[PDB]
Amino acid sequence: RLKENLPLITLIVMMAISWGLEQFNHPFGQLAFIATTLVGLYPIARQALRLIKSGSYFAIETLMSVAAIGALFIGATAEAAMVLLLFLIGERLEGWAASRVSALMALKPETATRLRNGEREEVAINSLRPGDVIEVAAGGRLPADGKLLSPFASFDESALTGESIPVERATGDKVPAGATSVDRLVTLEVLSEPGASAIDRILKLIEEAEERRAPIERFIDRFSRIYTPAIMAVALLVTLVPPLLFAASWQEWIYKGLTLLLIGCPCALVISTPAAITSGLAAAARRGALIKGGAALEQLGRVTQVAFDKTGTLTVGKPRVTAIHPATGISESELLTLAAAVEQGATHPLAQAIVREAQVAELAIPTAESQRALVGSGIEAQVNGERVLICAAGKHPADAFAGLINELESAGQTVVLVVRNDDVLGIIALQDTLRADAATAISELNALGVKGVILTGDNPRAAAAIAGELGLEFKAGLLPEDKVKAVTKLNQHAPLAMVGDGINDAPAMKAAAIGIAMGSGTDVALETADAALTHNHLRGLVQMIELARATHANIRQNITIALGLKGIFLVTTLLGMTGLWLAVLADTGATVLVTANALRLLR
Ligand code: ALF
Ligand SMILES: [Mg+2]
Secondary structure (H helix, E strand, O other), X not given: OOOOOHHHHHHHHHHHHHHHHOOOOHHHHHHHHHHHHHHHHHHHHHHHHHHHHOOOOOOHHHHHHHHHHHHHHOOOHHHHHHHHHHHHHHHHHHHHOOOOOHHHHOOOOOEEEEEEOOEEEEEEOOOOXXXXXXXXXXXXXXXXXXXXXXXXXXXXXHHHHOXXXXXXXXXXXXXXXXXXXXXXXXXXXXXXXXOOOHHHHHHHHHHHHHHOOOOOOOHHHHHHHHHHHHHHHHHHHHHHHHXXXXXXXXXXXXXXXXXXXXXXXXXXXXXXXHHHHHHHHHHHHHOOOEEOOHHHHHHHHXXXXXXXXXXXXXXXXXXXXXXXXXXXXXXXHHHHHHHHHHHOOOOOHHHHHHHHHHHHOOOOOOOOEEEEEEOOOEEEEEEOXXXXXXXXXXXXXXXXXXXXXXXXXXXXXXXXXXEEXXXXXXXXXXEEEEOOOHHHHHHHHHHOOOEEEEEOOXXXXXXXXXXXXXXXXXXXXXXXHHHHHHHHHHHHHOOEEEEEOOHHHHHHHHHOOEEEEEOOOOHHHHHHOOEEEOOOOOHHHHHHHHHHHHHHHHHHHHHHHHHHHHHHHHHHHHXXXXXXXXXXXXXXXXXXXXXXXXXXXXX
């Protein structure tokens, strides 16, 4: 697993020891150097050789191998060894900056419970045929896309919408695989073939997105494609031109040409980009960021747009009561203590929100008796003698709260009614609220010229409230495929980062230049993403985008340094005022410089 580092160490030891043999009995030591040079040159020579076969004649590996082989014939073994060492360090630095679908596979159960002849049987998920009647227990995931046979049921379809608010479904309604039966036990007619469920379609979206990802070419190869054949041509010329036109020594100009091949090897340049990225990834890691591989850092560097998920990303992902409006003769705390009295024990996030609000206010929740679900209306219990029902605003006559209810709902709120003996005792508003640092984070992104857009699977109103708060545009009521399409459309215009916390964000994340997951997000999200906000602080996005950008600057400086000195020591060499060892020393100095520069990212 770590045999990648071995050639480096072996080259080091072999080097130092070869020097030790240049301490007693030189000629025996030069053979040892030739051994070092050859063993370090081996993987690079065969690697290059494979590249020549694949059409690619002039990768940097070619230049390196040719220059080493030439340096062998001219006893520049110590130097060739040195440059090989630098190259190996660059290669390894690059290798360490490399990224190391199970979480989504865990969403498909392994067995289903099938019903035949009034007998239950546990079968493999792929044994399921359309028309089969399957039975999902409470809390269980649908193994396949089903049509509800049960009269009524609520489902957590967050794996498709990102919303944990249970969806009321009745006989005939389609329920997608991965959905969760929240309270009851359901029966469904399987609709989907094996391998063709909603989860499977998500997986397919992810795979396709990953396949459409174009690999970015390194600077060094685009460069080498012109530089390498150039300095080879020139070295041929400094070999041919002088003896053919000045009647000079073939030996000395052949020698000189090969020396130019070794000189031409741009050390520092190979360590140029890897040194920055290694520092950047190390700096991000130090301040609560998580980036998987250098390519991710480069993409992060070239990003100018952000697409946000809403629920769990921009918002805390939990309902919270925002307003309490009682009827006359009733205090807000009475309406609240009554609602909490009914809702206690219920798992519906709105109920939990109400109970919470009662608890932070130190309102003692009275015991409820005969608590039950009033199916398709709401949940009902009797508190201190009287039957009180808490229900959705569309389930009961508003009478005298109509206008207020409309006002609340248009503002992106969710309203529940408290009703005792068919009297509306008052309403309660709830909303999924913004995270503490969402606003400032957005404003900072805008300061960096990075515009945000919102892609959410939530309803238009709930979205429009939040997007209203942050001054962003939005697309709402979106399924995963729709997010992928939106993201593609935007990403064709400019490189985009997708920030989400949900399974349904996963395909979008892969469709974007870079996907970024919230810390509290779904495992699928954290695994699909190229990066992670381990703290759930949205501000830590700007930092990332800042760091990345600084990194992209650092590189550009480094290259210049590496490419500048080289140039100088290229031209001087061509004027005949500088030699091999000086050029090696200079490339080494260049390397020290780009290193020291790369270390500035740590500040
Ligand atoms: F959390 Al969402 F669309 F708002 F997945
Ligand atoms: Mg989400």
